[PDB]
Design a protein around this nucleic acid. Structure first.
Ligand SMILES: *C(=O)c1cnc2ccccc2n1
Ligand SMILES: *C(=O)c1cnc2ccccc2n1
Ligand SMILES: *C(=O)c1cnc2ccccc2n1
Ligand SMILES: *C(=O)c1cnc2ccccc2n1
Ligand SMILES: [Cl-]
Ligand SMILES: [Cl-]
Lengths: 8, 8
DNA sequence: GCGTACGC
DNA sequence: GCGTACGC
């Protein structure tokens, strides 16, 4: 759920 | 040489 | 000449 | 519920 590299 | 995650 | 950045 | 960010 976090987006820092994927954001899902 | 670039530093964006290691910076060497 | 090597690896940092988060949870809906 | 998945992976982005650069070259001295
Ligand atoms: C987001 O909160 C989050 C948490 N755990 C995960 C596990 C696997 C894929 C994506 C995820 N996203
Ligand atoms: C993004 O691609 C990504 C990959 N691994 C991680 C680990 C810890 C925090 C954030 C991250 N983001
Ligand atoms: C920095 O310019 C740079 C370029 N290539 C590398 C290869 C392996 C380790 C570190 C490196 N740093
Ligand atoms: C830092 O840990 C890191 C790792 N892989 C990369 C690939 C492309 C650009 C920058 C990167 N930085
Ligand atoms: Cl949980
Ligand atoms: Cl070269």
């Amino acid at each position: 759920x976090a987006x820092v590299x994927a954001x899902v």
